[PDB]
Ligand binder design. Structure first.
Ligand SMILES: [Mg+2]
Ligand SMILES: [Mg+2]
Ligand SMILES: [Mg+2]
Ligand SMILES: [Mg+2]
Ligand SMILES: [Mg+2]
Ligand SMILES: [Mg+2]
Ligand SMILES: [Mg+2]
Ligand SMILES: [Mg+2]
Ligand SMILES: [Mg+2]
Ligand SMILES: [Mg+2]
Ligand SMILES: [Mg+2]
Ligand SMILES: [Mg+2]
Ligand SMILES: [Mg+2]
Ligand SMILES: [Mg+2]
Ligand SMILES: [Mg+2]
Ligand SMILES: [Mg+2]
Ligand SMILES: [Mg+2]
Ligand SMILES: [Mg+2]
Ligand SMILES: [Mg+2]
Ligand SMILES: [Mg+2]
Ligand SMILES: [Mg+2]
Ligand SMILES: [Mg+2]
Ligand SMILES: [Mg+2]
Ligand SMILES: [Mg+2]
Ligand SMILES: [Zn+2]
Lengths: 53, 50, 158, 203, 118, 122, 86
RNA sequence: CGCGACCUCAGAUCAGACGUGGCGACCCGCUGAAUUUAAGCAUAUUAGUCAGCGGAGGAAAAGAAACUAACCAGGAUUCCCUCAGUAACGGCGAGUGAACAGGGAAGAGCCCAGCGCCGAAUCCCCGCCCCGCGGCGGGGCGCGGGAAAUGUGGCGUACGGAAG
């Protein structure tokens, strides 16, 4: 498909983060704790949610 | 030109009614300076623009 | 083609000067307009000093003029904090302040502090509400004897 | 606070982290069009320094000006006149590319009012700038007494009288001994006060 | 969903109709080209009265914004007589002349005596 | 006889139109009497009937809007005709509320340090 | 031949009367006006002829609205009031 | 595969507003010549002038020191007298040419971002009620909708400031 320019722009940006030699200060955000740890973190953090309106 | 457009015929219709002379009771008025219609237009002499 | 003898001279009329000429035929019109505006301001601030706030003793700079004493911009805040007048209240009661001025000396600072105290002894502060007086305030019988002075408040003599 | 950290972060532009970020943003902004609305600033600290507050009514554009000097817009060579004014291609424009970037968005949005502007990226052939604008008829600024000064009709098109921070810096404007030729309002007001005759009445 | 065609086109979005919170104008504008100020006067020339007698028609001066349908409905409302056809021209002085050919059961000379021209 | 704008204001909406079309009919008959060759007693009246048309239509067009801007006055969105048509710059100047309101830091400054009435001695 | 003979061949006119300035300068092939510059949004106006400006500046025609605002200014644009009746 | 957030980006005759164009004497930003002078002429000069373009207001611009100074020190801006036809520039030729100081006119100062601390303490819009409403505002109710933590408001800004 001849995609629109914003779709082609964001997909090529996602490809450039794979091509380019990404510095470690930006590479460090790729390593995220796994989904068995994230559910534990969010079940603890759901207790202490701030009050709403 | 017998193929006139409407705005040109509209223009000619006004320039034809402006060619009428003064009414002869105008020079009976008190503060009048006008002897005759001075902006008259003869169709040989001045060709109206357009 | 200069003649026999005289100054050879440089008139600056080589530009187009007749287009940019300032004729002063509204000179007496402005000398009426300014004094009408000044009378209106002096009526508008009704007991207050007509010249404006009080402005300090200053020395001129620059060797030609340092023997003389001028009126300055405003009382320095070092000269205010040792006179006891707060930096915000001074401009309310009629004391010009500028924070930019230093004080290199001690004689000038003591002269301006003495000038502020001699001013504060002379102002007649009216109550902020006319019925009930307060503590930082002048007496009732002194309120009838107030008037606008003309010219600069405590004019600077050399 | 985080703004001191990201200010000192954006100061280190020659570093590899910010160099990677500048070239990725410059690729993206070069692919995208000439004058489009950014939804939020790329420099949230610098926008706050220049005047932006994240409330309803402030609008950020990133625009690109085409980089380079200014050759003389004249047919082929042929600037007719004396050999002083024979210069064509090494001429430089009086205002800056950031001021041109302000006035292009200020002309593209005539309803809004250019507050200020800043730098996001560059390459060999473009400069990019985020000019931040204020919608002067929104009630979140016409009811705010410290930003309703821009809703007054005096400040229509600050970018084209040259009253912004980057439009100001080409006026020769400032205090000092360096700026004698603009005392008065401008370098035209200075010239006009100097080149008149005050022919008095009496003389 | 499978992309059958290798082009991308704009998806058809919903859009509402104008439901304004106040009308722009306060009240609709009065019809200034009505059935009285659409017909100025009838002519009384000999070429118009000779047109009235044999042809069984009327000759009017109307203003130049009027359709033949408007002149037909105007003459039928004013003088309550049916109209066969309408022929219009614009005179060289600039105003429209209309020729209202009447129904054959309606004579033009009697309705001319009614409308005042003789 | 002499129709004037005072007593037309008490009339109701259909009565004014029933007088309007009667004056229209009388103007049309006077135009026909102008064309056929009529007396000066009618070619003078041809102005009176036109200004009578105007005097009636003024009363309709005034009472219609005197009803409309009383219908719309309690509402926040008035039509552009009923909005006040002064000059363009003063229909978009800041209003008497949002020009009057002051930030509370400036309210504290003009609270703590008001301008005093005073006078100095000679 | 270039003179009296060649003055006969002219029948197809270049310009016509414009529909903004009203003058006869609407060039038919260029579709633009000579005096007002019609398809451009801005009025054609140059001050190398003040005598071309003062033919139609603001003081020329009817001023059918600005005439009224010049006399509505001198009461402060008093609107919505009527004077007190008898 | 679906459902849901968010982020980027479209679409509307969506709800409500805003810009366009003119005059242009005065003001601001840019562009900007040649006649002319040099007894020629090319640098200079005319000149940041005419013409060109954009933007305004009832005035604009400037403006509260990254200042002047070198003194016993002055103190935002603008205008006037003066400095001064001076210092200076210039085929050092023709020509060009300010400022500081002093005297006056006027006189007014201030606000953010940051550093922080306060349970977003902040703002916009719609719905209903009361008042006023021809400069759409004040109050009350909305387990009604958004903005905003990618930072709104209060204190606070170089004259220091905050807390105890
Ligand atoms: Mg002939
Ligand atoms: Mg001799
Ligand atoms: Mg030269
Ligand atoms: Mg300013
Ligand atoms: Mg610089
Ligand atoms: Mg041709
Ligand atoms: Mg123009
Ligand atoms: Mg809409
Ligand atoms: Mg304009
Ligand atoms: Mg020469
Ligand atoms: Mg010579
Ligand atoms: Mg020569
Ligand atoms: Mg020059
Ligand atoms: Mg010019
Ligand atoms: Mg105006
Ligand atoms: Mg101003
Ligand atoms: Mg400062
Ligand atoms: Mg000075
Ligand atoms: Mg030499
Ligand atoms: Mg020069
Ligand atoms: Mg001085
Ligand atoms: Mg004085
Ligand atoms: Mg604040
Ligand atoms: Mg904060
Ligand atoms: Zn035209």
């Amino acid at each position: 498909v001849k995609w629109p320019r914003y779709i082609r722009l964001q997909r090529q940006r996602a490809i450039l983060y794979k091509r380019l030699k990404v510095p470690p200060a930006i590479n460090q955000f790729t390593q995220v704790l796994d989904r068995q740890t994230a559910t534990q973190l969010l079940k603890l953090a759901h207790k202490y949610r701030p009050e709403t309106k | 030109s017998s193929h006139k457009t409407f705005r040109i015929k509209r223009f000619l219709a006004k320039k034809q009614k402006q060619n009428r002379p003064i009414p002869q009771w105008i020079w009976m008025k008190t503060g009048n300076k006008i002897r005759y219609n001075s902006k008259r237009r003869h169709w040989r002499r001045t060709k109206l623009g357009l | 083609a200069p003649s026999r003898n005289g100054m050879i001279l440089k008139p600056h009329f080589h530009k187009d000067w007749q287009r940019r000429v300032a004729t002063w035929f509204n000179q007496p019109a402005r000398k009426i307009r300014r004094r009408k505006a000044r009378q209106a301001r002096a009526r508008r601030i009704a007991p207050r000093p007509a010249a404006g706030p009080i402005r300090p003793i200053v020395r001129c700079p620059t060797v030609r003029y340092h023997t003389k004493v001028r009126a300055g911009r405003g009382f320095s805040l070092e000269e205010l904090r040792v006179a006891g007048i707060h930096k915000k209240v001074a401009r309310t009661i009629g004391i010009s302040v500028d924070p930019r001025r230093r004080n290199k000396s001690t004689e000038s600072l003591q002269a301006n502090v003495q000038r502020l105290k001699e001013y504060r002894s002379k102002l007649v502060l009216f109550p902020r509400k006319p019925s009930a007086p307060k503590k930082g305030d002048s007496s009732a019988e002194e309120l009838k004897l107030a008037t606008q002075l003309t010219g600069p408040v405590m004019p600077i003599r050399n | 606070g985080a703004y001191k950290y990201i200010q000192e972060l954006w100061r280190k532009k020659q570093s590899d982290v910010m160099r990677f970020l500048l070239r990725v943003r410059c690729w993206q902004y070069r692919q995208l069009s000439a004058l489009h609305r950014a939804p939020r600033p790329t420099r949230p600290d610098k926008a706050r320094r220049l005047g932006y507050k994240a409330k309803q009514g402030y609008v950020i554009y990133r625009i690109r000006v085409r980089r380079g000097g200014r050759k003389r817009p004249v047919p082929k060579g042929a600037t007719y006149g004396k050999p002083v004014h024979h210069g064509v291609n090494q001429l430089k424009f009086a205002r800056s590319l950031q001021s041109v970037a302000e006035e292009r968005a200020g002309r593209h949005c005539g309803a809004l009012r250019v507050l200020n502007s800043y730098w996001v990226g560059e390459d060999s052939t473009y400069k990019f700038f985020e000019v931040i604008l204020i919608d002067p008829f929104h009630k979140a600024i016409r009811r705010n007494p410290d930003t309703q000064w821009i809703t007054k009709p005096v400040h229509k098109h600050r970018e084209m009288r040259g009253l912004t921070s980057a439009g100001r810096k080409s006026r020769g404007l400032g205090k000092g001994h360096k700026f004698h030729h603009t005392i008065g309002g401008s370098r035209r007001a200075a010239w006009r006060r100097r080149n008149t005759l005050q022919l008095h009445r009496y003389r | 969903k499978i992309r059958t065609s290798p082009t991308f086109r704009r998806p058809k979005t919903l859009r509402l109709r104008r439901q304004p919170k106040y009308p722009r104008k306060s009240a609709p504008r009065r019809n200034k080209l009505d059935h009285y100020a659409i017909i100025k006067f009838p002519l009384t020339t000999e070429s118009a009265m000779k047109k009235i007698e044999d042809n069984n028609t009327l000759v009017f001066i109307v203003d130049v914004k009027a359709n033949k349908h408007q002149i037909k409905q105007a003459v039928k409302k004013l003088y309550d007589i049916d109209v066969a056809k309408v022929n219009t021209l614009i005179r060289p002085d600039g105003e429209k002349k209309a020729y209202v050919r009447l129904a054959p059961d309606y004579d033009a000379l009697d309705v001319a005596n009614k409308i005042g021209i003789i | 006889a002499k129709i004037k704008a005072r007593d037309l204001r008490g009339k109701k909406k259909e009565e004014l139109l029933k007088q309007l079309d009667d004056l229209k009919v009388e103007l049309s008959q006077l135009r026909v009497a102008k064309v056929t060759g009529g007396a000066a007693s009618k070619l003078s009246k041809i102005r009176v009937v036109r200004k009578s048309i105007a005097r009636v239509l003024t009363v309709i067009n005034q009472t219609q809007k005197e009803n409309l801007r009383k219908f719309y006055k309690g509402k926040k969105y008035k039509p552009l005709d009923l909005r006040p048509k002064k000059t363009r710059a003063m229909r978009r100047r800041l209003n008497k509320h949002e020009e009057s309101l002051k930030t509370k830091k400036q309210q504290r400054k003009e609270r703590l340090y008001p301008l005093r009435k005073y006078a100095v001695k000679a | 031949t270039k003179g009296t003979s060649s003055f006969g061949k002219r029948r197809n006119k270049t310009h016509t009367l414009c529909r903004r300035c009203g003058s006869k300068a609407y060039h038919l092939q260029k579709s633009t006006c000579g005096k007002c510059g019609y398809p451009a949004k801005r009025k054609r106006k140059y001050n190398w002829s003040a005598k071309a400006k003062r033919r139609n500046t603001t003081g020329t025609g009817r001023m059918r609205h600005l005439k009224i605002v010049y006399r509505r200014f001198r009461h402060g644009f008093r609107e919505g009031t009527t004077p007190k009746p008898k």
